Design an enzyme around this catalytic site. Structure first.
Site, PDB file in Angstrom:
ATOM      1  N   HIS D 200       0.956  -1.275  -0.041  1.00  0.00           N
ATOM      2  CA  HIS D 200      -0.098  -0.030  -0.021  1.00  0.00           C
ATOM      3  C   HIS D 200       0.831   1.295   0.201  1.00  0.00           C
ATOM      4  O   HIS D 200       0.239   2.241  -0.488  1.00  0.00           O
ATOM      5  CB  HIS D 200      -1.012  -0.036   1.014  1.00  0.00           C
ATOM      6  CG  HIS D 200      -2.030  -1.027   0.676  1.00  0.00           C
ATOM      7  ND1 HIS D 200      -3.137  -1.339   1.840  1.00  0.00           N
ATOM      8  CD2 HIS D 200      -2.349  -1.946  -0.267  1.00  0.00           C
ATOM      9  CE1 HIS D 200      -3.864  -2.359   1.080  1.00  0.00           C
ATOM     10  NE2 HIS D 200      -3.533  -2.588  -0.044  1.00  0.00           N
ATOM     11  N   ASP D 227     -12.682  -9.764  -7.928  1.00  0.00           N
ATOM     12  CA  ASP D 227     -12.253 -10.913  -6.766  1.00  0.00           C
ATOM     13  C   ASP D 227     -13.096 -11.806  -6.345  1.00  0.00           C
ATOM     14  O   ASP D 227     -12.946 -13.241  -5.971  1.00  0.00           O
ATOM     15  CB  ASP D 227     -11.457 -10.091  -5.326  1.00  0.00           C
ATOM     16  CG  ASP D 227     -10.375  -9.360  -5.736  1.00  0.00           C
ATOM     17  OD1 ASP D 227      -9.675  -9.707  -6.844  1.00  0.00           O
ATOM     18  OD2 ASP D 227      -9.442  -8.807  -4.803  1.00  0.00           O
ATOM     19  N   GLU D 270       4.035 -34.925  -1.940  1.00  0.00           N
ATOM     20  CA  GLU D 270       2.970 -34.285  -2.822  1.00  0.00           C
ATOM     21  C   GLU D 270       3.496 -33.379  -3.915  1.00  0.00           C
ATOM     22  O   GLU D 270       4.513 -32.801  -3.732  1.00  0.00           O
ATOM     23  CB  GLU D 270       2.256 -33.437  -1.665  1.00  0.00           C
ATOM     24  CG  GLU D 270       1.427 -33.858  -0.540  1.00  0.00           C
ATOM     25  CD  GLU D 270       0.264 -34.792  -1.031  1.00  0.00           C
ATOM     26  OE1 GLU D 270       0.170 -35.946  -1.016  1.00  0.00           O
ATOM     27  OE2 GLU D 270      -0.638 -33.884  -1.381  1.00  0.00           O
TER      28      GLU D 270
HETATM   29  C1  LIG Z   1       3.425 -32.384   2.377  1.00  0.00           C
HETATM   30  C2  LIG Z   1       5.176 -32.705   2.527  1.00  0.00           C
HETATM   31  C3  LIG Z   1       5.608 -31.439   2.322  1.00  0.00           C
HETATM   32  C4  LIG Z   1       4.992 -30.017   2.244  1.00  0.00           C
HETATM   33  C5  LIG Z   1       5.705 -28.688   2.170  1.00  0.00           C
HETATM   34  C6  LIG Z   1       7.205 -28.821   2.094  1.00  0.00           C
HETATM   35  F1  LIG Z   1       7.809 -27.655   2.067  1.00  0.00           F
HETATM   36  C7  LIG Z   1       8.113 -30.132   2.233  1.00  0.00           C
HETATM   37  C8  LIG Z   1       7.148 -31.395   2.201  1.00  0.00           C
HETATM   38  F2  LIG Z   1       7.935 -32.387   2.146  1.00  0.00           F
HETATM   39  O1  LIG Z   1       5.168 -33.059   3.861  1.00  0.00           O
HETATM   40  C9  LIG Z   1       5.589 -34.444   3.718  1.00  0.00           C
HETATM   41  O2  LIG Z   1       6.046 -35.153   4.618  1.00  0.00           O
HETATM   42  N1  LIG Z   1       5.819 -34.706   2.454  1.00  0.00           N
HETATM   43  N2  LIG Z   1       6.089 -35.947   1.928  1.00  0.00           N
HETATM   44  C10 LIG Z   1       7.613 -36.346   1.431  1.00  0.00           C
HETATM   45  C11 LIG Z   1       8.447 -35.481   2.091  1.00  0.00           C
HETATM   46  C12 LIG Z   1       9.975 -36.038   1.556  1.00  0.00           C
HETATM   47  C13 LIG Z   1      10.092 -37.421   0.718  1.00  0.00           C
HETATM   48  C14 LIG Z   1       8.662 -38.258   0.604  1.00  0.00           C
HETATM   49  C15 LIG Z   1       7.587 -37.565   1.028  1.00  0.00           C
HETATM   50  C16 LIG Z   1       5.229 -33.800   1.582  1.00  0.00           C
HETATM   51  O3  LIG Z   1       5.235 -33.762   0.392  1.00  0.00           O
END
Ligand SMILES: C[C@@]1(c2ccc(F)cc2F)OC(=O)N(Nc2ccccc2)C1=O
Ligand code: HEM
Ligand code: HEM
Ligand code: HEM
Ligand code: HEM
Ligand code: HEM
Ligand SMILES: C[C@@]1(c2ccc(F)cc2F)OC(=O)N(Nc2ccccc2)C1=O
Lengths: 241, 60, 49, 378, 53, 75, 49, 378, 75, 96
Positions: D200, D227, D270
């Site tokens: 802003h 929006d 994910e």
């Molecule tokens: C959702 C997630 C995640 C979200 C945000 C982030 F910055 C890192 C992550 F690993 O948390 C998690 O345990 N996994 N899974 C994952 C992480 C490392 C190796 C294999 C699976 C994600 O994808």
């Protein structure tokens, strides 16, 4: 080991975007659970009250719970007694431990069947293909025979013997109980066990799309109305001389 | 011979009071009519629900 | 749409299917002598016989 | 005088949402800020209603999540709104960052630098949440991410054991993560207010990258209704996920309860973490990989210093446009490699995509801006 | 101290805003009835009898 | 915080505007709309599309190669 | 049980006096104690529900 | 120009804590605002570190609190800092309200009316927290307070069963209360910022009740060092409670686990709720009692309309001073009666103290102000 | 928000101040201090004290009465 | 918990060694009895509250972990309970 084969796409009555489960096929598939699977498989997250909406009456499900003895917590002596069975009680457990499961099944643990559709890639397609897809091993490949050949199981050597060509079950409506049909019903039921919300989810889903089909053009027309003032504005530059 | 949009404006839309009253009466009657249709569409698509339940009830 | 989400979030706070289940209690009547009030566990919160 | 203008509370609402001079010409791509705010409140509301039923013990964490989905009235929609809302949050985050990159919105130093903090804070938030249902991916995901800290020389082991509360991810870890996951979105909400304050001071950038003081419109009714339309498109995309494909972005191994003794054969993040995961495992060294992963996010804080063009926006810059789209497609490639096993074609191409990511940003895009200047005799 | 608001101008201003105040009352009552699905009133509305038995 | 009246100096510009109640919300919506999106597509295709095709080609090669690597033929 | 000025029930919290029918007689409480739905099948056992 | 003066963030800190024109003459009694802010951050920090170990199931709630106090390193100080911090919070709340009453600080309508909301919000906060360790007093306290809602005509039963999630205080109730207890202090923190915003429109009142524009000093160094000294006196009083008398304000029945089948014979609130508890049970009617209880707190919102004096403060008002101290001593009497059984002298005197509370505020203090005006020929 | 320079109009007032480094933090702390607290106590006692004594008397009566009510002497 | 306080590490290991525990299963799925360690809690006389009531003619002996903090008077009450057993006065008959 190493090499894999992936399941085909069977056209379940519940596959398409607005397509509910066949609840008659849920009814038959419970019976497959009770008769065949429950001797080896836990289903820790389905109780007898869950069936009442779905595949039985209130009176029917009370009577099905009445078939098993439970164990209830104590009276005045401090005791633990056995109980005729209710509706609040969960599906009955074949084993007290995971280790007792392994001891019966020559080292292999039969996994819980509450979430098994959602816990495998392919869902019901994988389970159907596991059940209807038992064959002889190819040349080169010898097992223990404690372990059994399945081309859909990873590694090819499953600790589950075929539970399926056995032509079981009281049938009520009385459809033919073939290996194909017994697998069709059990997979339809195991979807329901994994996802009781399936039918509500899709009714809501239709209601959403119909509402969004109204609301999206209308909100668009509202934004077009307000923005008209700007989108049709004319500018002129009129400097001196 | 005057328009229906013109009448809906004159009688109902001019006052914000009546405009709000129209929407709320509108929403109650809409909720009934939308749910009734959207059930019946979903019902006609499906037919293995408790469409079956004539089998197992009334025996009781 | 607002009614429907709000009601659903409202209903989530209501007694879950979990909690609504029938209970019902067996009482042995000859084990309660003349004069006396006996207190049993039912539904979480006591039943006086 | 108006009430709206000089009432000490309504003043703030007035200057943010009603009378705020806004560029006439801001596109679709400017919708993602309000959409991120919507995403935050969605995550807050559904999350609170999940916290009303979830318990944070190892013995009961999976079961309480199951209890939400069968037994709690409409617990399934709330649960799935939350899971898919997290994905919506990252979709909106990435569109928003990408807008900033392309349009030179990063020249607002303080606004941008707070946005980086906002990104690192939602990342930490969504990691700690995913752990909570205590599935297999919850556990091993918890294991892999937490162990990234053990690469830090001298202090690394002491740091991870401290955040575990023990010798692995355990009882102490899950409960911790529930508490940290509850607090952090309220911290996010406060940093989002600070973000909006810094903005802003200048108002918005626009597609052209040219000052729009000559052609400002009031935020209301124009961007209030724009929006609204944006929010209803977010609701469509979220509800499509919850009511038609609730498991599409979920890993099936998270439907199996956490096992501390056995990994899954695959192990994948994910979708929104797959580029960074590809960057980490590109390096055949422990410390090298994590440093590469950290630097893949933290590079956004260097993007202001690598601006080299005499024009703000990429609108009038065809060379930079080609290199930007080359970055996006490199990121798509990295998200592909992230989701695949550490085997033959995928290793070397994962390495090449990782090199190219850092080559585009650190070298290639600042060379394009200089060439484009020279081309315009500037 | 609220003797201030007593006089013919204030009575006329009351008369002008009274159809509006009562129409808003109508909005609120029908709004509350709709939002709670209220039993007593909505059994008596001749369409919208979607309880029946 | 920026406010109207304090933004910048503008001289000699006439703006003509119509009421939204006087005018169309969707004026020539298909007849002018689809020529414009076609013109916009043409203007940007050569910048946007060639990275994604280059991803697609590396995608289709990479998947084909890996599938074909997980096979023998002599031992 | 078996307390108060009426020989039924005393609530020690704010001073409710109930008789042998569970009927309110003295203190803050508006209503007689709740009679559940019950039937007798034998005079040895009662099911309450 | 200074950085401190015109940096968009440091601006806010400057106008609140550095360059803020403050009355030269504000006493000790003005320390309680900063002390309430300290109390809030203390409750936040200790509470988060408790949330790292506490579980919210009926089977494990008592045990997890026990686990904090034996097994978790320094869990006992954190637990007791929290329990006694809650008491410190109410001590500071009551001193602060009392200052407002005596000095006519309630003439700041919006500031005062938000303070009422702040009071009702900390009350709801501390109620829901006390439930959490699942002792006997936790449970029956939960039972008594929640049932206050059942007195509401027509809708009352439906409302309480809704907040239970069931037919009594149970599994659904405790988990709920953990989630609501976590969220509400962050809501408090936001309403406390709004409180401070409204205040900065006028600045502070002073002991004399006369405008102090003629004699303002900068907040720093004067009230920065005065507030530091105030905080160290708060730390002394808190630490005396935690390190020498940790059970002094606690009920021993809360060390027995919750029993749903059997009440304690006594049943008493924590000290800060004893006046309101005395007011409720003074009325031989269900609805009458709760309405009296609600009205005993909500009366503060009517105190602005009952100001009748031509002077703001009670400093130059001996009649009002006598009646104010009569209120404080009436409140002491009500806290005494709150903590005692419903038996012979205590009932009738509890009724008389309840009448006098409402007589002092609604009738007697506004008559004193009028007499005092007449006495000064005003 | 109020700021110095914009508060109010003051004319003809001289303030004399000393540095804190030039002067005592506790000037005549007991010798002037305790006379002042004594004067402050006197000024307020008649307003503050008589409600609390009236509590104390109702406290001591009320406790004595209740204790003595929880006894018989004939039956 | 005793190791800091009133015993040595070796002493408290030996005191735990006096009792048998029950440990969770090996490969058969079994529940066996165990010589007793340091991690194990003080041993429980009863499996239920109802079993406590059955032994003690209807009365439940309360848990003794918090009993000082769970009664007014603390240790003074417990001392006075223990050292203060006497004959009933005339008028007062019990069950025995
Ligand atoms: C959702 C997630 C995640 C979200 C945000 C982030 F910055 C890192 C992550 F690993 O948390 C998690 O345990 N996994 N899974 C994952 C992480 C490392 C190796 C294999 C699976 C994600 O994808
Ligand atoms: C009844 C028709 C039935 C079904 C259905 C079924 C399902 C099934 C699945 C899906 C698996 C999981 C495979 C996987 O890990 O991907 C599996 C596993 C085992 N089962 Fe089973 N099961 C059915 C019934 C039976 C019966 C009657 C027995 C006993 C003869 C049996 C045993 C097992 C065992 C052992 C396994 C573990 C296999 C392994 O991983 O080695 N099941 N079941
Ligand atoms: C917590 C998530 C975030 C929220 C709630 C949010 C909030 C918003 C809002 C409301 C806008 C104004 C409208 C618009 O242009 O979109 C905006 C603009 C801005 N945001 Fe964010 N933001 C967040 C994440 C980020 C991130 C991750 C960055 C990049 C590191 C970013 C950098 C900026 C910049 C530079 C602008 C100025 C855009 C311009 O005018 O062109 N923000 N933010
Ligand atoms: C302060 C508001 C929040 C609260 C109280 C909260 C609470 C919850 C709870 C109780 C769970 C466990 C239940 C479950 O897994 O379904 C959960 C999981 C989750 N949280 Fe949140 N949450 C909040 C906001 C956040 C935010 C901002 C994000 C980041 C977008 C986030 C990301 C998620 C994810 C990814 C999961 C796992 C969902 C799953 O797959 O089951 N939540 N959170
Ligand atoms: C969440 C607890 C609260 C916090 C953090 C707090 C914050 C404070 C602060 C920092 C001050 C300025 C310094 C001072 O005069 O003490 C203050 C002044 C004020 N507070 Fe509060 N307050 C809270 C509770 C209340 C309550 C319960 C009320 C009464 C209903 C109250 C009414 C006021 C008023 C009227 C003033 C102006 C005092 C004057 O200048 O004489 N506040 N508040
Ligand atoms: C958002 C920060 C807060 C968090 C995360 C929090 C969390 C906790 C937790 C986990 C407990 C249960 C453990 C225990 O009983 O020792 C607790 C209890 C308690 N909370 Fe909080 N709390 C917060 C702030 C509040 C505030 C502002 C108050 C009101 C002054 C409050 C009043 C208390 C009380 C009275 C208890 C019971 C303590 C006891 O006697 O054991 N807390 N809270
Ligand atoms: C701490 C407490 C409380 C705090 C704030 C409040 F506004 C009301 C309360 F009851 O919560 C609670 O359960 N009790 N205990 C209690 C309440 C009613 C009857 C008996 C005990 C409290 O004093």
């Amino acid at each position: 080991s190493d090499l894999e084969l992936h399941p085909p796409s069977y056209p379940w009555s519940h596959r398409g975007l607005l397509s509910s489960l066949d609840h008659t096929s849920i009814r038959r598939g419970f019976q497959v659970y009770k008769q065949v699977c429950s001797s080896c498989h836990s289903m820790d997250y389905v109780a007898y009250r869950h069936l009442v909406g779905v595949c039985y009456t209130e009176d029917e499900a009370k009577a099905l719970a009445e078939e098993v003895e439970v164990q209830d917590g104590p009276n005045e002596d401090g005791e633990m007694f056995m109980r005729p069975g209710k509706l609040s009680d969960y599906f009955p457990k074949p084993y007290p431990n995971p280790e007792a499961a392994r001891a019966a099944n020559n080292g292999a643990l039969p996994p819980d069947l509450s979430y098994i559709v959602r816990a495998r890639h392919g869902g019901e397609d994988y389970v159907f293909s596991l059940l209807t897809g038992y064959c002889e091993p190819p040349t080169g490949v010898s097992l223990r025979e404690g372990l059994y050949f399945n081309p859909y199981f990873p590694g090819q050597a499953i600790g589950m013997a075929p539970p399926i060509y056995n032509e079981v079950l009281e049938f009520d409506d009385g459809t033919p109980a073939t290996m194909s049909q017994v697998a069709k019903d059990v997979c339809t039921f195991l979807r329901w066990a994994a996802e009781p919300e399936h039918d509500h989810r899709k009714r809501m889903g239709l209601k959403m799309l119909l509402m969004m089909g109204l609301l999206l053009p209308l909100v668009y027309a509202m934004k077009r109305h307000k923005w008209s003032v700007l989108k049709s504005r004319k500018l002129a530059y009129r400097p001196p001389k | 011979a005057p328009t229906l949009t013109a009448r809906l404006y004159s009688l109902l839309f001019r006052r914000t009071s009546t405009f709000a009253l129209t929407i709320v009466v509108g929403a109650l009657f809409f909720e009934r009519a939308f749910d009734q249709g959207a059930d019946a569409i979903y019902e006609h698509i499906n037919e293995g629900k408790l469409w079956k339940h004539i089998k197992h009830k009334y025996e009781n | 749409a607002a009614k429907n989400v709000v009601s659903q979030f409202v209903s989530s706070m209501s007694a879950s299917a979990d909690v609504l289940a029938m209970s019902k209690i067996e009482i042995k009547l000859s084990d309660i002598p003349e004069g006396k009030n006996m207190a049993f566990k039912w539904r979480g919160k006591p039943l006086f016989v | 005088t108006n009430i709206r203008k000089s009432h000490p509370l309504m003043k703030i609402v007035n200057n943010a949402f009603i009378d705020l001079p806004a560029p006439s010409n801001i596109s679709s791509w400017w919708n993602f800020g309000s959409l991120l705010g919507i995403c935050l409140i969605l995550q807050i509301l559904t999350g609170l209603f999940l916290a009303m039923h979830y318990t944070s013990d190892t013995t009961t964490a999976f079961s309480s999540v199951t209890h939400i989905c069968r037994d709690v009235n409409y617990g399934w929609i709330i649960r799935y709104m939350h899971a898919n809302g997290a994905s919506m949050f990252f979709i909106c985050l990435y569109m928003h960052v990408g807008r900033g990159l392309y349009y030179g919105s990063y020249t607002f130093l303080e606004t941008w630098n707070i946005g980086v903090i906002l990104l690192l804070t939602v990342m930490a938030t969504a990691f700690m949440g995913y752990v909570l249902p205590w599935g297999q991916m919850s556990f091993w995901g918890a294991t892999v991410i937490t162990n990234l800290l053990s690469a830090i020389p001298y202090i690394g082991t002491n740091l991870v054991e401290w955040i575990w509360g023990g010798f692995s991810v355990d009882k102490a870890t899950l409960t911790r993560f529930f508490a940290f996951h509850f607090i952090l979105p309220f911290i996010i909400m406060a940093i989002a207010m600070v973000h909006l304050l810094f903005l802003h001071e200048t108002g918005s950038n626009n597609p052209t990258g040219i000052s729009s003081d000559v052609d400002k419109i009031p935020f209301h009714p124009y961007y209030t209704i724009k929006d609204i339309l944006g929010a209803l498109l977010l609701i469509l995309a979220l509800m499509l996920l919850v009511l038609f494909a609730p498991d599409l972005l979920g890993d099936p191994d998270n439907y199996t309860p956490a096992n501390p003794l056995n990994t899954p054969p695959h192990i994948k993040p994910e979708w929104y973490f797959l580029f960074a995961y590809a960057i980490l495992r590109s390096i055949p060294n422990k410390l090298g990989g994590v440093l590469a992963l950290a630097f893949s996010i933290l590079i956004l804080a260097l993007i202001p210093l690598l601006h080299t063009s005499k024009q703000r926006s990429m609108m009038f810059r065809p060379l930079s446009q080609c290199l930007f789209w080359a970055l996006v497609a490199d990121l798509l490639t990295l998200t592909w490699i992230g989701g695949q096993p550490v085997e033959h074609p995928y290793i070397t191409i994962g390495q090449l995509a990782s090199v190219l990511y850092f080559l585009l940003i650190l070298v290639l895009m600042p060379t394009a801006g200089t060439i484009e200047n020279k081309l315009l005799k500037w | 101290m609220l003797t201030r608001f007593l006089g013919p101008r204030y009575r006329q201003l009351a008369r002008n805003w009274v159809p509006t105040a009562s129409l808003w009352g109508a909005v609120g009552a029908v709004g509350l009835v709709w939002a709670t699905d209220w039993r007593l009133i909505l059994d008596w509305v001749p369409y919208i009898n979607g309880k029946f038995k | 915080g920026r406010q109207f009246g304090h933004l910048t100096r503008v001289r000699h510009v006439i703006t003509y505007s119509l009421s939204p109640f006087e005018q169309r919300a969707f004026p020539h919506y298909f007849s002018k709309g689809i020529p414009n999106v076609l013109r916009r597509t043409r203007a940007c295709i050569l910048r946007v599309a060639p990275p994604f095709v280059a991803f697609y080609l590396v995608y289709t090669w990479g998947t084909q190669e890996f599938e074909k690597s997980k096979r023998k033929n002599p031992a | 049980a078996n307390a108060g000025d009426f020989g039924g029930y005393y609530c020690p919290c704010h001073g409710s006096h109930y008789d042998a029918s569970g009927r309110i007689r003295k203190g803050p409480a508006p209503l007689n104690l709740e009679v559940p739905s019950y039937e007798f099948t034998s005079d040895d056992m009662v099911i309450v529900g």
